[PDB]
Amino acid sequence: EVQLEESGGGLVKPGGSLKLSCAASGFAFSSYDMSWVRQIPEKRLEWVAKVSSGGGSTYYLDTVQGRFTISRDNAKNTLYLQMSSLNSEDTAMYYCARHNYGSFAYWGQGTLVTVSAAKTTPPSVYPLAPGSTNSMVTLGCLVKGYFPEPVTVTWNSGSLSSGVHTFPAVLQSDLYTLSSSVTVPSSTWPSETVTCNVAHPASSTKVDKKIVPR
Amino acid sequence: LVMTQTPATLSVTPGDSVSLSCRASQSISNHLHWYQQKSHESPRLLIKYASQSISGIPSRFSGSGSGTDFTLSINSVETEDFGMYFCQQSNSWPHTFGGGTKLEIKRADAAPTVSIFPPSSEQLTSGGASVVCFLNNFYPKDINVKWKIDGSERQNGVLNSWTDQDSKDSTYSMSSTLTLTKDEYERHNSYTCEATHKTSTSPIVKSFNRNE
Numbered sequence: 230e231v232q233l234e235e236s237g238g239g240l241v242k243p244g245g246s247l248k249l250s251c252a253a254s255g256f257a258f259s260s261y262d263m264s265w266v267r268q269i270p271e272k273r274l275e276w277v278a279k280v281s282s283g284g285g286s287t288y289y290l291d292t293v294q295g296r297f298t299i300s301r302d303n304a305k306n307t308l309y310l311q312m313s314s315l316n317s318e319d320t321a322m323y324y325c326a327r328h329n330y331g332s333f334a335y336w337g338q339g340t341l342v343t344v345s346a347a348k349t350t351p352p353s354v355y356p357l358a359p360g361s362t363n364s365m366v367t368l369g370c371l372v373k374g375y376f377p378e379p380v381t382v383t384w385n386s387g388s389l390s391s392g393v394h395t396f397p398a399v400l401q402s403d404l405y406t407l408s409s410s411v412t413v414p415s416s417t418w419p420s421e422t423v424t425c426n427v428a429h430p431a432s433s434t435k436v437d438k439k440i441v442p443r
Numbered sequence: 444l445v446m447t448q449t450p451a452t453l454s455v456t457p458g459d460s461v462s463l464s465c466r467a468s469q470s471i472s473n474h475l476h477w478y479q480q481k482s483h484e485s486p487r488l489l490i491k492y493a494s495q496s497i498s499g500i501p502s503r504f505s506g507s508g509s510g511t512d513f514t515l516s517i518n519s520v521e522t523e524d525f526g527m528y529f530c531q532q533s534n535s536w537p538h539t540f541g542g543g544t545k546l547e548i549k550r551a552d553a554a555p556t557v558s559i560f561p562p563s564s565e566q567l568t569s570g571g572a573s574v575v576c577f578l579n580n581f582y583p584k585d586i587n588v589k590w591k592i593d594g595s596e597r598q599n600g601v602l603n604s605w606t607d608q609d610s611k612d613s614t615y616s617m618s619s620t621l622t623l624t625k626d627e628y629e630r631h632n633s634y635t636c637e638a639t640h641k642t643s644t645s646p647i648v649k650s651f652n653r654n655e
Contacts, residue, residue: 272618274486274540293636324486329491330492331476332476332492332531339485357563358560358563360559360560366576367558369577394577394616395606396604396616397605401602408604
């Protein structure tokens with residue numbers, strides 16, 4: 230079964246360069262044309278570049294011409310996208326995709342590329358505990374001032390899965406903020422501990438925050 | 444070469460049928476493919492070459508058209524069909540996609556569960572103050588959230604975020620955060636979160652008093 234795994238995404242300063250990689254398995258890599266398709270914050274898809282099965286014929290979106298280079302290593306089952314002279318318009322989720330002639334039949338999971346002058350900053354994690362009586366209680370944590378996206382939120386290290394709501398990040402002045410809520414039985418809190426776990430890969434940070442009564 | 448997709452948004456009750464329109468500026472023969480995109484997931488090929496469906500895709504999905512006009516019809520929409528749909532052209536360079544269509548599942552009206560949170564002593568230490576409001580498991584998506592400080596309505600430093608439609612119960616949740624300086628937070632007593640929603644004539648109010 231087809232597997233596509235892109236990597237190399239991250240924060241790059243404008244006018245900078247970045248190399249994206251896409252590992253492929255479960256198919257004859259060299260017998261298929263590969264593409265890079267990016268999803269912009271607007272949610273719009275934009276085809277970026279295509280490389281032929283043998284790597285002889287390369288095609289690029291005009292706005293990306295001369296700045297990007299799509300290449301492939303058939304022996305290494307890896308696809309590449311070397312990017313340079315990056316601009317704000319190049320900020321997107323980058324997907325590598327296997328063709329079925331004109332269609333993109335199989336897609337990867339996606340690698341985020343942030344093009345900004347803003348620096349990497351770890352989140353500050355705040356507990357959201359109710360002010361000083363129902364069958365359920367709602368807790369949460371506020372993940373404030375981070376850059377770039379993404380962050381991950383679990384409750385009790387993955388153990389608490391039901392009643393969990395993780396809200397999309399909102400970008401306010403080069404910093405993201407997100408919140409996550411959990412609804413647990415009233416009888417179990419604070420009797421049993423509820424902790425929110427925050428992972429920010431860009432700054433290699435992880436925060437565990439206990440939610441204590443006010 | 445421009446691909447124009449309509450409608451942009453679609454609201455479908457389960458059992459009901461819909462169709463998406465994809466329009467090409469110039470004839471693209473049958474070189475038009477259709478995709479589906481669920482939340483936190485990558486696009487997936489639904490129909491290739493205007494009408495050829497893909498192995499594993501429900502028969503309810505039927506692509507049609509040639510030249511400049513193409514359709515994607517879905518018979519008896521299921522809860523699982525929610526998400527984003529895109530047509531793509533492979534006739535000429537660069538390959539283009541349509542603007543997309545957001546397909547939403549209609550369901551029973553659900554009132555939100557509103558919870559108010561005051562600022563934590565850890566944020567107050569850093570000289571900041573966020574008042575957080577969660578509005579979970581409601582339908583329809585349209586909801587009006589207002590913040591009142593000592594009775595006066597406030598929008599500066601308010602930020603909202605809606606989740607995408609829930610896969611299991613087709614409801615929505617939303618988070619509203621009112622951020623102010625610590626010093627300003629200490630100048631006021633009552634902090635309220637007000638939600639106007641179609642499930643009640645009167646808004647849902649959640650209050651916190653800094654003095655209590």
